[PDB]
Amino acid sequence: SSSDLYNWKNNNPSFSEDPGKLTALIESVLTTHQPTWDDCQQLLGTLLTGEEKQRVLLEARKAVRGNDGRPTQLPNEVDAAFPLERPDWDYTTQRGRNHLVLYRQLLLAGMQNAGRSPTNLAKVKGITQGPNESPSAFLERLKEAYRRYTPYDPEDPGQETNVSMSFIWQSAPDIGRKLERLEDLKSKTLGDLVREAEKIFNKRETPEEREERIRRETEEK
Amino acid sequence: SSSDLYNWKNNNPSFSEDPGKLTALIESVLTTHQPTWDDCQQLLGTLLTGEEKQRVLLEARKAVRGNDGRPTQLPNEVDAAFPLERPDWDYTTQRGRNHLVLYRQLLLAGMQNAGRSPTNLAKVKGITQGPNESPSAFLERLKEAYRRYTPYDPEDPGQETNVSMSFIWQSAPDIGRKLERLEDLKSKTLGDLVREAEKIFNKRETPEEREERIRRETEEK
Amino acid sequence: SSSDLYNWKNNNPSFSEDPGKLTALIESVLTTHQPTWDDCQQLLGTLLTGEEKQRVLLEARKAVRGNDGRPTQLPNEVDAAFPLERPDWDYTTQRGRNHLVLYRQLLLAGMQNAGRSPTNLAKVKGITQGPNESPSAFLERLKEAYRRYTPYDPEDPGQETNVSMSFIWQSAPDIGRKLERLEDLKSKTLGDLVREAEKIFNKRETPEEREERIRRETEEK
Amino acid sequence: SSSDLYNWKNNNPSFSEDPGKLTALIESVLTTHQPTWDDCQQLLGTLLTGEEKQRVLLEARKAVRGNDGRPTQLPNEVDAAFPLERPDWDYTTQRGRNHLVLYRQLLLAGMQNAGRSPTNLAKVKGITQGPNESPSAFLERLKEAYRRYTPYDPEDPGQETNVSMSFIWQSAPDIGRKLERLEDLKSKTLGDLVREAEKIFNKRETPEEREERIRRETEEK
């Protein structure tokens, strides 16, 4: 029904604004509505701009795997899995159904990867600890940026040193300089670094603490 | 009607954003619409992402109880209560109806527990008293975090020392240091601690009080 | 129509968030739609959570009155007025209609009282005059909290000393200390107290007034 | 057989003395003997005193859940699940059998909760470290009291600060005073606290150590 298509469009941000929204909606519809190849063209054509759809389609074709489970750029294999022109898939046949299943899976992959927005290498670098922001709150914002703007899971054990380095570099300057000077820095987990940053953050100075220090200095000399 | 399903989706945050919203909507629908097992698959499939649904389904299976009222991980019992594949339940039979009742109850449990978001042990620690925030207002925010992000009821008598310790640790530093030094601290109720914190909060200094203190010091010397 | 029920739900906050919203909607519907007992179960079941509905139902049963106009906890009387299980009320009979009228009235009472949220004894105490807030503006916020979070009408003559005491206690500290010291304090109306607080609020000091005082002090010595 | 009933009674402590004993025996019998409602009355009537049985029965009725999986105090629902008077349950019917299953489950719940003995808030506070008792041995006794006399599992992550506070408060006075003074106390796990207490416990003084200190003081002056 065109009312469904337009409602989906109108109740969500554009793909470019926030890819997660439409991707999740389309992932759901791909299941509940079991769209054919033509139906998928209407979905994409209605919910995405020309430039977004193109990104998604190339990303979907890049997600095709050969029978050895590895990527393939062989035209015939790519075309057979994710055709750009109407295929002869017959939904009354197991053959047709299997192609439809795969097509939908690849379409989803395409959207997920096109959303990735080319490892937002700048959005992650732009997460800097605020002057009042606790180290744990800053770390959560930094992890959120990794999730949204990179393909790397900040909770993976293999990403720990990577997240740790961003955490040290992008902490407030006093904190970052002290974390950098920690003894056996290589041995510090992300949790260790947060605890060390908290010691600096919590055992610092405050306007009341500055008034107390000024009073103690005036009592001294 | 697909219009109902999509309306429910579009008028609520995602499950991940705020699990309470969709959980309450689904709890209601489970009653008013008396869904079958297939209907429940459409509900879940339409309102949740693939990753959310999975969490919910495993949480629902973890909520199954044996005839002795205790948890069970026995495949046959788990499968019989909360099947992952279409069951042969016939709604025209008391047997079918009872399974449907239980299934819906477990589905709800699954959502409630999946929402729990693994005892947000960080969200509770992140509630810190603001510099202008009264102790009672801070305590209410702290209790709200316990409710939303842990399975513990902050109003339970058995949670009092737990909430008390968070209250002391996460109060503004001047207040927390004084609460920690209270005589017979073990004997203080949560209400006592709030009253003691209020004494510090209210009998402190203000910019007008600082101007008065500076005037009194200038009158002194 | 399920569209009406779901529209009512989706266009309002939850009962817990703001009880007034749904209570007013349901009060209206109880009149325009003249619901039967089953209809009321759908209303409640759809618009309230399990925990909210329970609160409302117990509150409704607590609102039942005997023939002497007084509360009654006599099971038969409570059950007859507000049955928890489907009653045999026949809307084609004056008997059935009268029970329906009473049921709807009690349902409304239940919601009104369940909303009361147990005399939010903390929300009223949490209304504190802001540093720039006029005494009359503060008093209006304090009265709003009485209305929303207690069963007491702050405009009732019998509540005047009660509101007066909250007004004095929760005024800005300089104001509250002076109001407390007023001669013949017992004789002061709420209006008197507001006028006395205004004298303190308006005849105080300002940054321009502080600059003028500093200039006068520098001219003095 | 009355011999079984009296043997069970005579080979166990009373419910009041140690609820776990009879509860475990009855849980077993409820399974192996598949008792009817009347059989359960004989079990309870024979193994419990009048006052114990009453506690158990009210606790069992308090454990009844509605179809939404939540507690219910609706007379008809409570009565239907756990009747105080002989029900018409026919064990030759699936309907009768299901009620029997539920009844037995609720009976067990009732006993488990009646045993709880109202969160023995005093038994837990009464666990104090002995003068020769190691911190780990004391902690195990403290956890045992939580298990026996509260509904809280001392091994739950959400109970850690609660157990930690009891551990600090009820440690031997020298130990408790030092644990209270630990830097970053909020950051200490239960395991950390035990290790810190062990440092105090093991690096203290002994009668031989006192003789050595007296000899060193006599050598000094």
Numbering used by the authors:
A (entry chain A), B (entry chain A), C (entry chain A), D (entry chain B): 16 to 236
Manuscript text:
The CA domain and immediate downstream residues mediate protein interactions in the immature shell, and, following proteolytic cleavage, CA forms the mature viral capsid. In this study, we have determined the structure of the truncated MLV CA-CTD by X-ray crystallography and have resolved the architecture and CA lattice structures of immature and mature MLV particles by cryo-ET and subtomogram averaging.
Immature MLV particles were purified from the culture medium of HEK293T cells transfected with a proviral MLV plasmid containing a mutation in the viral PR gene. Subtomogram averaging was performed essentially : subtomograms were extracted at positions underneath the spherical viral membrane and were subjected to iterative alignment and averaging, resulting in a structure of the hexameric immature CA lattice at 6.6-Å resolution. The structure shows two distinct curved layers corresponding to CA-NTD and CA-CTD. Hexamers are packed together by a dimeric interface in which the C-terminal end of helix 7 (black arrowhead) interacts with the loop between helices 4 and 5 (red arrowhead). This density comprised six extended rod-like densities consistent with α-helices, running parallel to the sixfold axis ∼15 Å apart (black arrowhead). As this six-helix structure is positioned between the truncated CA-CTD and NC domains of Gag, it must consist of residues of the CAH that had been deleted in the CA-CTDΔCAH protein used for X-ray crystallography. In the CA-CTD, an additional density is seen for helix 310b in the subtomogram averaged structure (black arrowhead), indicating that the helix is present in the immature virus and is not an artifact of crystallization. The CA-CTD dimerization interface involves interaction between helices 9, as is the case for other immature retroviruses, but also seems to include an interaction between helix 310b and the base of helix 9 in the vicinity of W184 (Q192 in HIV-1; Fig. 3B, asterisk). Here, we show that, in immature MLV, the CAH at the C-terminal end of CA forms a similar helical bundle.
